[PDB]
């Protein structure tokens, strides 16, 4: 599977000092100068033959994301924005990289310019977190002090000026071209893709977004080789990924496991096993709330790649695995993701406003098994209107964990249809 | 998600950056790129809330000023957060989070054990003033699923009992242990680990040649 | 372990580590 | 040269560099259906009411947005770009408050035609409906805003064709009101032109509230005489005596717009 | 279930309203 | 007179028509009967307003009693709800 | 903003007396081609219409609206 | 049954008239309403087609039972609405009964 | 939906091309619309004969006059359009 030799992520579950201090010792910003000296054509080569794909809720392949942005300067200055919004239900997984290994997004942020000319990168790490930027902020403090960051970064002529950015509490604040505006200091409402970030972004330069975790992986990727990191998994969905397992299982923990492992093997090795017993798993979130739920039938069968999991009709999105076991109102917990997504949606677009306030109407009756049968499939109908019709991802999002309820549970949502039909 | 004028909150209501406030305003704007103020409001704005919860019309007012926006610009970003407050809000402002990976797990009997020892509701405030209960959304940290963020605390893994402890270090006394309340270390699995136990590689371990 | 000020004023003190940022060129959007 | 070579159906319909989808249905003759698009206007994408179907693509696209590009095939009348618009309309007609008999932009209302023409024969939801909180903007335009369709056409002509950045969205959700966040109201000259650009009846004309109903009222064409831009302008006449004055448009002089003095 | 003739008349009011002279000489 | 006080004039030239044959005009004036109605105490945010009946009375609407400062009216029925 | 009204040519009689009539204060009118709106769709035709008929005529050259320039990426700039 | 005259003037039941008879004209009353200053049916013009009964969204205007008003003057034909009101409430409970027999049919 | 018998649609359209054919002369246009009829148009010297022949052939035997009417489209130069619709 993984060995500790073969690790991207060192640091984990703290237990070492979050410190450049400790991240030296740990072995971070290694030759940095030489990385930067190899130019950046040679660092994409890297991430493209690492096959790094996107760690974020969507994985795009890191090295095209990142070449499309290599394009020449047009007197704009270039730069990098990394989104360290944890905003997906479930996933504590980010969290952990900038709370313990901060150093190594300082040096992912420097290589990440590296690659694509930005003279400076902003970190928006979600309000929330003000516990955690402050230490990150620290690290980065240190690192100007070492001379990493700054002018000449570590010698090597190359200027770069990190920063850190305050979120307030918006899931969307997190989606790509929100996340700019809320840079920008407008309101937080995603942007149309035409005029894509690379060509127009953060303050209308050149701009690129990245998970934390596709940021952290790169200069690691690139010391050690595109060859390391490919080997370990298969084709396309190529990587170490950070797994989190939270909800009905003996030992919720951030593995940090290799990809493409059986969800049985992740849930079984770590994660201790399936709250009482394997056979009490109602259902499955392999990626998170946005993504679509799978049956225990399906589970042990499908493994965590992404391209496994579309096969599955489900995304591996940000590998949030949340696990309900029989002992759960499925009807109520997706009923609140869709509660989740109400209190959220940015409202800039009329198929997410309307549509997603519709279906938690129509799913708080399903809950309580006011509404008729006949009303379920309807849902089904409302669900697609909104998939494919919405400026942002986000109501592709609210409209898969419904139609997950409905694929795999329709018989149950029935029953709580004809449980109240009976008492009258 | 309107505002009308009260004696309370008004632009008659007194906001100025302290001279302290002041200089760090600036730090933010030269942050931003040069030409560039108004990518600032959120930033200043959240300094606004720091100097004062309940962030009046008034402070809005100067926030815009400072940064020299449409007021309205300012008045559209705090409404669309939620981590601003346009109310005034307790000393505490607790807030349970209420999703999936918390609901399993049971957080509603956190937040009831939150309600009971507040003789509050969630969303009401006790008169004490030092305690506002709110049922927010993900917070991260759902390894940790139960989960009660005070003001960024943060506190993490808690059983009912923890929480209500927590409040009593709160009503009277200092702040409780920051961060989670149980034997996993960190988000580790819950008894010990299985992963990472080979002391950390050296620096240039295997590294790929040049 | 850190108080509501620990941020900004953290920033304020990062402030001795940076370029003067570029400008669109105008004085307001 | 800059003609780029785009099928609208078959029609291939040459544009410039830059021709938006939209655009190029309007040069080969057709009318994508539109809420938040205004010709002198910024493009907004709100509604989303204009999604098309570019030929071999997965996904419907944003008809007043896409640059459409090369070798595209525009299909408008498509099986999909119908349910494209059976479905949006589902939408803005689900929160809608049905008072069209006090809607006085009965007649006069791009979102019952929209919906005559591209919506559905019935309604689905059988959820209930939201109210907002009819406020003041002024002493001309009277917004019973529970109408707004957040197609945010108000607030950019109050920003850019008038340059009174005043109004605002506030909020998020389903409760995002397009409103003054305090009440101030909206005093500028070109302020009138809100009714005429809002598709909806939320905000529209108070002293012009209930005097008529627009399939009545004769409308004979004629010229500004309050100021000396002589902007052109209808003169919407009812059994014979003037029940309204609105902008009618003239390319050099007044393009669709009409000065609160003059109306 | 266990002189009066309806005049007709408009009910809608002047409309158009002329400019009273000025009763002041002038 | 009547509801918009139709009056013809002692100087009008159609004032004539009545004479020897009396005028039509209303008791109970509608003007002021709902503002003789109760305000519709409501415990919600908003209410509807069936106009009483369903079919048989007015497109439904649903009306923001929000703001105490103002009873919501439907602008159907002039029935003003308090809060 | 709908344009469907805005295609086919029309001829329209000049407007005339429209008095008050004095038992039901309806609007009254003694001038018959004042409803009689003809449509013509082109300009040509149109202009024929009115020389075989005699009556005068005054066309007004049609006004379509100028192409405009629109993109979403040009608004984001924050240069202008 | 509060008191307050149906009709909002939305005037759709003027634009389905086949004979042109209903002229309505409407401003703000003073309450803020949207009230008909001036609603006359001309009887004579009236083909008693039943469309208004129609088209009317408050239903406010409807077919009354009576068919005995014949008049010896033919301005008493011509209706104005304080005459169609006064017939309102002479005939509001047989029309109530009227409507209620009928309307689940409509 | 309509209950459109195609089988209609044919064999009057393939009258429509015998008459084309038979009186090449002032025939203009033909057309079966989707209604499912017929509607020669015929040059106005043509009113004679085409209608005598569709009076009198077997194989178009078309006996009564349903209507003579004139629809008066004002654009159009000739303003009127005479239509007559046989049995
Ligand atoms: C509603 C919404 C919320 C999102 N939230 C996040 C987030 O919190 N963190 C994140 O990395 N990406 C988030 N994304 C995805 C980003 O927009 C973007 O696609 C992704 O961060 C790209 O990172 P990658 O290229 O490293 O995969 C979100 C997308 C949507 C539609
Ligand atoms: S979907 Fe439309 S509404 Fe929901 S977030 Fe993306 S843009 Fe805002
Ligand atoms: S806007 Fe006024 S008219 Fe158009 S639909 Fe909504 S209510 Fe009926
Ligand atoms: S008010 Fe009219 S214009 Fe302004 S947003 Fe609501 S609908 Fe669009
Ligand atoms: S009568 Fe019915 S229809 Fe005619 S106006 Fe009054 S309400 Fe509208
Ligand atoms: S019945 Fe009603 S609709 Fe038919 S004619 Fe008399 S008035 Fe006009
Ligand atoms: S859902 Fe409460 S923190 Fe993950
Ligand atoms: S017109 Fe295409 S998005 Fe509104
Ligand atoms: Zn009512």
């Given at each position: ?18 410190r ?6 740990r072995?971070?910003?290694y030759?940095?100068?030489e ?18 794909r ?43 990289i ?11 942020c ?8 930005a ?13 955690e930027?402050?230490?990150?902020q ?7 002090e070492?001379?990493?960051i ?11 000026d ?20 809320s840079?920008?200091?407008?309101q937080?409402?995603?942007?149309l ?32 080789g ?14 170490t ?24 093997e ?15 798993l ?63 949606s ?7 406003r ?9 799913m ?14 309807s ?27 409905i ?18 | 998600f ?28 030269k ?17 606004a809330?720091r ?25 559209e970003?705090?409404?669309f ?68 963020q ?37 988000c ?23 | 372990?850190?108080?509501?000020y ?8 990062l ?15 | 040269?800059?003609?780029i ?56 696209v944003?008809?007043?947005?896409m ?28 929160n ?10 009965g ?47 108000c ?9 009174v ?70 003169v919407?006449?009812?059994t ?24 | ?20 002279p ?5 | 007179?009547?509801?918009?006080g ?8 159609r ?5 020897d044959?009396?005028k039509?005009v ?5 003007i ?52 | ?11 329209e ?5 429209r008095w ?23 300009k040509?035709?149109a ?8 009556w ?22 924050w240069?202008? | ?12 039941c003027?634009?389905?008239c086949?004979?042109?008879?209903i ?30 009964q129609?088209?009317?969204?408050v239903?406010?205007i ?21 005459k ?23 | ?15 429509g ?37 569709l ?14 009417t ?6 159009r ?7 007559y619709?046989?049995?």
């Amino acid at each position: 599977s993984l060995k500790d030799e073969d690790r991207i992520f060192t640091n984990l579950y703290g237990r070492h000092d979050w410190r450049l201090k400790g991240a030296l010792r740990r072995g971070d910003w290694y030759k940095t100068k030489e990385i930067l000296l190899k130019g950046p054509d040679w660092i994409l080569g890297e991430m493209k033959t690492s096959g790094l794909r996107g760690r974020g809720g969507a994985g795009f392949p890191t090295g095209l994301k990142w070449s499309f942005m290599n394009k020449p300067s047009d007197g704009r200055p270039k730069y990098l924005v990394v989104n360290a919004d944890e905003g997906e239900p479930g996933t504590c997984k980010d969290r952990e990289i900038m709370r313990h290994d901060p150093h190594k997004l300082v040096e992912g942020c420097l290589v990440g310019g590296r690659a694509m000319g930005a003279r400076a990168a902003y970190i928006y790490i979600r309000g929330e977190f003000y516990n955690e930027a402050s230490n990150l902020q620290v690290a980065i403090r240190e690192a100007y002090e070492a001379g990493l960051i700054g002018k000449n970064a570590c010698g090597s002529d190359y200027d770069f000026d990190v920063f850190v950015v305050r979120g307030a509490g918006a899931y969307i604040c997190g989606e790509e071209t929100a996340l700019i505006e809320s840079i920008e200091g407008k309101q937080g409402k995603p942007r149309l893709k035409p005029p894509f970030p690379a060509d127009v972004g953060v303050f209308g330069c050149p701009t690129t977004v990245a998970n934390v975790e596709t940021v952290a992986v790169s200069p690691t990727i690139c010391r050690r080789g595109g060859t390391w990191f490919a080997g370990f998994g298969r084709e396309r969905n190529s990587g170490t990924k950070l797994f989190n397992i939270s909800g009905h299982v003996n030992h919720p923990c951030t593995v940090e496991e290799e990809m493409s492992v059986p969800l049985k093997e992740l849930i079984e090795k770590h994660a201790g096993g399936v709250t009482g017993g394997w056979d009490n798993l109602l259902a499955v979130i392999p990626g998170g709330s946005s993504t679509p739920l799978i049956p225990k039938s399906v589970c042990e069968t499908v493994l965590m790649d992404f391209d496994a999991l579309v096969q599955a009709q489900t995304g591996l999105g940000t590998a949030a695995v949340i696990v309900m076991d029989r002992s759960t109102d499925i009807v109520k917990a997706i009923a609140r993701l869709i509660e989740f997504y109400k209190h959220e949606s940015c409202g800039q677009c009329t198929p997410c406003r309307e549509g997603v306030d519709w279906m938690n109407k129509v799913m708080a009756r399903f809950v309580k098994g006011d509404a008729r049968p006949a009303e379920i499939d309807s849902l089904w109908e409302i669900s697609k209107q909104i998939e494919g019709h919405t400026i942002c991802a986000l109501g592709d999002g609210a409209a898969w964990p419904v139609q997950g309820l409905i694929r795999h549970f329709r018989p149950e949502l029935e029953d709580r249809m004809q449980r109240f039909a009976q008492q009258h | 998600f309107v505002h009308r004028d009260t004696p309370e909150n008004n632009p008659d209501t007194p906001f100025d950056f302290t001279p302290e406030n002041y200089k760090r305003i600036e730090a933010i704007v030269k942050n931003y790129p040069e030409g560039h103020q108004a990518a600032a409001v959120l930033p200043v704005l959240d300094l606004a809330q720091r100097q004062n919860g309940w962030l009046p019309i008034s402070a809005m007012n100067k926030v815009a000023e400072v940064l020299q926006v449409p007021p309205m610009r300012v008045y559209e970003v705090a409404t669309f957060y939620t981590m601003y407050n346009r109310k005034p809000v307790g000393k505490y402002h607790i807030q349970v989070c209420t999703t999936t990976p918390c609901m399993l797990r049971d957080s509603d009997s956190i937040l009831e054990t939150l309600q009971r020892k507040l003789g509050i509701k969630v969303g009401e405030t006790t008169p004490d003033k030092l305690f506002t209960l709110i049922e927010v959304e993900c917070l991260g940290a759902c390894v940790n699923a139960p989960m009660v963020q005070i003001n960024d605390n943060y506190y993490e893994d808690l059983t009912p009992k923890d929480i209500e402890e927590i409040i009593d270090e709160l009503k009277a006394g200092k702040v409780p242990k920051p961060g989670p309340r149980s034997g996993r270390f960190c988000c580790e699995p819950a008894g010990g680990l299985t992963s990472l136990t080979e002391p950390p590689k050296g620096p240039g371990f295997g590294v790929q040649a040049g | 372990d850190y108080n509501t000020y620990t941020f900004l004023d953290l920033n304020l003190d990062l402030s001795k580590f940076r370029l003067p940022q570029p400008s669109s060129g105008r004085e307001s959007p | 040269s800059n003609l780029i070579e785009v099928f609208v159906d078959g029609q291939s319909v040459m544009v410039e560099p830059g021709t938006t989808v939209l655009q190029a249905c309007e040069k080969v003759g057709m009318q994508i259906p539109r809420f938040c698009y205004h010709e002198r206007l910024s493009v907004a994408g709100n509604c989303r009411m204009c999604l098309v179907e570019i030929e071999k693509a997965p996904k419907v696209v944003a008809a007043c947005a896409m640059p459409v590009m090369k070798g595209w095939n525009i299909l408008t009348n498509s099986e999909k770009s119908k349910k494209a618009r059976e479905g949006v309309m589902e939408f803005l007609l689900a929160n809608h408050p049905l008072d069209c008999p006090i809607c006085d932009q009965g007649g006069e209302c791009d979102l019952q035609d929209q919906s005559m023409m591209f919506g559905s024969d019935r309604s689905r939801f059988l959820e209930g409906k939201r109210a907002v909180e009819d406020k003041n903007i002024g002493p001309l335009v009277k917004t019973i805003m529970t109408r707004c369709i957040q197609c945010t056409r108000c607030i950019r002509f109050a920003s850019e064709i008038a340059g009174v950045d005043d109004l605002g969205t506030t909020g998020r959700g389903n409760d995002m009101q397009v409103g003054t966040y305090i009440e101030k109201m909206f005093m500028s000259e070109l302020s009138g032109n809100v009714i005429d650009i809002c598709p909806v009846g939320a905000l529209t004309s108070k002293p012009y509230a209930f005097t008529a109903r627009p399939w009545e009222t004769r409308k004979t064409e004629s010229i500004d005489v309050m100021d000396a831009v002589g902007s052109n302008i209808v003169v919407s006449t009812r059994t014979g005596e003037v029940m309204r004055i609105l902008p009618r448009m003239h390319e050099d002089i007044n393009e669709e717009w009409i000065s609160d003095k003059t109306r | 279930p266990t002189p009066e003739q309806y005049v007709p008349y408009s009910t809608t009011r002047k409309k158009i309203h002329e400019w009273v002279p000025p009763s002041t000489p002038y | 007179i009547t509801h918009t006080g139709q009056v013809y004039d002692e100087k009008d030239y159609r004032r004539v028509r009545f004479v020897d044959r009396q005028k039509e005009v209303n008791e109970n004036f509608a003007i002021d009967l709902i503002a003789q109605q109760p305000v519709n105490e409501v415990e919600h945010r908003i209410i509807a307003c069936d106009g009483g009946g369903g079919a048989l009375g007015h497109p439904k609407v649903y009306i923001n009693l929000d703001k105490e400062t103002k009873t919501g009216t439907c602008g159907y029925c002039g029935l003003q709800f308090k809060q | 903003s709908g344009v469907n009204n805005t295609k086919k040519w029309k001829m329209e009689f000049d407007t005339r007396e429209r008095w008050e009539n004095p038992l039901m204060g309806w609007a009254s009118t003694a001038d018959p081609l004042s409803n009689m709106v003809l449509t013509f769709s082109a300009k040509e035709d149109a202009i024929a219409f009115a020389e075989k008929n005699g009556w005068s005529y005054d066309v007004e050259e049609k006004k379509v609206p100028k192409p405009k320039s629109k993109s979403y990426g040009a608004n984001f700039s924050w240069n202008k | 049954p509060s008191g307050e005259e149906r009709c909002i003037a939305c005037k759709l039941c003027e634009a389905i008239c086949p004979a042109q008879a209903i002229t309505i004209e409407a401003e703000p009353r003073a309450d803020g309403s949207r009230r008909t200053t001036r609603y006359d049916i001309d009887m004579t013009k009236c083909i008693y087609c039943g469309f208004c009964q129609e088209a009317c969204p408050v239903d406010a205007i409807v077919e009354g039972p009576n068919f005995e008003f014949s008049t010896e003057t033919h301005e008493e034909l011509l209706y104005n609405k304080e005459k169609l009101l006064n017939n309102g409430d002479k005939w509001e409970a047989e029309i109530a009964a009227n409507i209620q027999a009928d309307y689940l049919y409509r | 939906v309509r209950p459109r018998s195609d089988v209609t649609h044919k064999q009057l359209s393939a009258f429509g091309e015998y008459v084309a054919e038979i009186l090449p002369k002032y025939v203009q246009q033909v057309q079966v619309s989707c209604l499912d009829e017929l509607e020669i148009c015929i040059h106005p010297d043509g009113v004679i004969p085409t209608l005598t022949f569709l009076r009198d052939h077997t194989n178009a035997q078309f006996k009564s006059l349903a209507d003579l009417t004139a629809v008066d489209v004002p654009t159009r130069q000739n303003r009127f359009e005479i239509v007559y619709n046989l049995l």
